[PDB]
Design an enzyme around this catalytic site. Structure first.
Site, PDB file in Angstrom:
ATOM      1  N   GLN A  22       6.370   4.624   0.616  1.00  9.85           N
ATOM      2  CA  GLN A  22       6.791   5.991   0.907  1.00  9.85           C
ATOM      3  C   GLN A  22       8.064   5.997   1.735  1.00  9.85           C
ATOM      4  OE1 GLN A  22       2.953   7.288   2.437  1.00  9.85           O
ATOM      5  NE2 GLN A  22       2.731   8.584   0.621  1.00  9.85           N
ATOM      6  N   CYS A  47       0.834  -1.235   0.000  1.00  9.95           N
ATOM      7  CA  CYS A  47       0.000   0.000   0.000  1.00  9.95           C
ATOM      8  C   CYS A  47       0.863   1.279   0.000  1.00  9.95           C
ATOM      9  CB  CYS A  47      -0.958  -0.116   1.199  1.00  9.95           C
ATOM     10  SG  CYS A  47      -2.266   1.115   1.414  1.00  9.95           S
ATOM     11  N   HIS A  48       0.802   2.081   1.072  1.00 13.41           N
ATOM     12  CA  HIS A  48       1.652   3.271   1.203  1.00 13.41           C
ATOM     13  C   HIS A  48       3.057   2.981   1.755  1.00 13.41           C
ATOM     14  CE1 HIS A  48      -2.178   5.497   0.791  1.00 13.41           C
ATOM     15  NE2 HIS A  48      -1.424   6.493   0.370  1.00 13.41           N
ATOM     16  N   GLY A  49       3.293   1.739   2.166  1.00  9.19           N
ATOM     17  CA  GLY A  49       4.561   1.370   2.724  1.00  9.19           C
ATOM     18  C   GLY A  49       5.777   1.920   1.964  1.00  9.19           C
TER      19      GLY A  49
END
EC number: 3.5.1.124
Lengths: 166, 166
Positions: A104, A100-102
Site C-alpha cells: 500500500q 502483506c499490506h506493505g
C-alpha cells in the site's frame, strides 16, 4: 548497510520483528521510523521502539527499505514524507522488501507502473490498478523489489532479500 | 540438516516462529514436535502447526534441537519422550539452542551439571541447582549448547546457532 523500516501501530508483529533480527544478525544496522519516536504496538501486542520520526529521515539517508504489513501501511501511506522516502529509495534502485499490506505504501508512492510483485491477495486489485503485474507466489524478485504475501512466507522473503544486502 | 523444535501451547511466539523461518531460510528442514499433532497457540496468539507428536520422534532422528521459551517448557518438561529426545541429542553433541524458559527442558533431561549457559533470570536459581554455571549474556556458546534469554536476543542467538549448523 543501514536498513530502514517504516511502520506504525498495528504492524503485523512477525513481519516487523523477525526481519529486524534477521538483518541485524547479518551485521547490518536496522532503524524503525514511524509518526513519532516512542513505541509502536503490533496487532498481537508486541512493542517495538521507534528510532526516528519520518520527518527526521532523509530520502537518501538509508541503503535499503523494509515495508512490513499489518494495519500499519494503511496509515503510513498517508504521511507525505514516508511516501516521499519510499519513492526516492525505490526509484534509486535501493533494495526494497515488502510483505502483506506493505505495498500500500508503494502504491501511494506511485512507483509500481510496469513492475511485478505480490502482496496479500486482499489488495491484489489495488496493486494491479497501480500498474503492476500481481502474481501469487511466496516471494517475487523484480529487480530491487522483493515482495511476499503473508507471515508463512517469511523464510523465502528474507532468503531473497538478504541476497540484495550482500 | 533436519532441525527439531520442541514446544506446546503457550510458547513465546517470536522465539518459536522467527527461528523456524531463519533455519528454513538456510534450506534446512524444520519440524515442530509437541504432545499431539494439530495447532499450538502462543502467548501472543499466533498459531503454529505441530508436525509430529513427541512419540513419533526418534531420539537419534534429527540433527539439531531448538528449545523456545514461554510457558510451554514447563509442560514439555513433563513428557518422558521429550526429555529422552533432548537428553540423547544434547549428550550426542548435536547443536541445541535454548532461549528464555527453554532450559527447563534441559534441567529435566538431567544434562546441565558442569555446563554453562543463560536463560531468563527468573529461572537462574533452578539452572544453578541443576549444576550449571549461569551467566547473564545475550548469547552463550558452551560446546553444542547455544543459549539466550529473551526475544531481544534473537539476532545474536541465531547468529551463533547457525554457525553450528554449518
Amino acid at each position: 548497510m543501514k536498513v530502514l523500516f517504516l511502520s506504525a501501530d498495528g504492524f503485523e508483529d512477525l513481519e516487523l520483528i523477525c526481519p529486524l533480527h534477521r538483518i541485524k544478525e547479518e551485521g547490518h544496522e536496522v532503524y524503525v521510523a514511524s509518526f513519532e519516536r516512542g513505541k509502536i504496538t503490533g496487532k498481537h501486542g508486541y512493542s517495538v521502539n521507534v528510532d526516528l520520526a519520518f520527518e527526521e529521515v532523509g530520502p537518501d539517508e538509508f541503503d535499503a527499505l523494509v515495508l512490513p504489513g499489518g494495519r500499519a501501511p494503511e496509515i503510513v501511506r498517508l504521511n507525505e514524507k514516508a511516501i516521499e522516502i519510499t519513492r526516492k529509495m525505490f526509484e534509486a534502485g535501493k533494495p526494497v522488501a515488502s510483505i502483506c499490506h506493505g505495498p500500500q505504501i508503494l502504491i501511494s508512492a506511485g512507483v509500481l507502473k510496469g513492475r511485478k510483485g505480490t502482496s496479500t491477495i486482499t489488495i491484489r486489485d489495488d496493486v494491479v490498478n497501480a500498474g503492476a503485474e500481481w502474481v501469487n507466489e511466496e516471494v517475487v524478485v523484480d529487480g530491487n523489489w522483493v515482495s511476499s504475501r503473508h507471515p508463512g512466507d517469511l523464510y523465502a522473503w528474507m532468503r531473497e532479500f538478504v541476497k540484495l544486502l550482500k
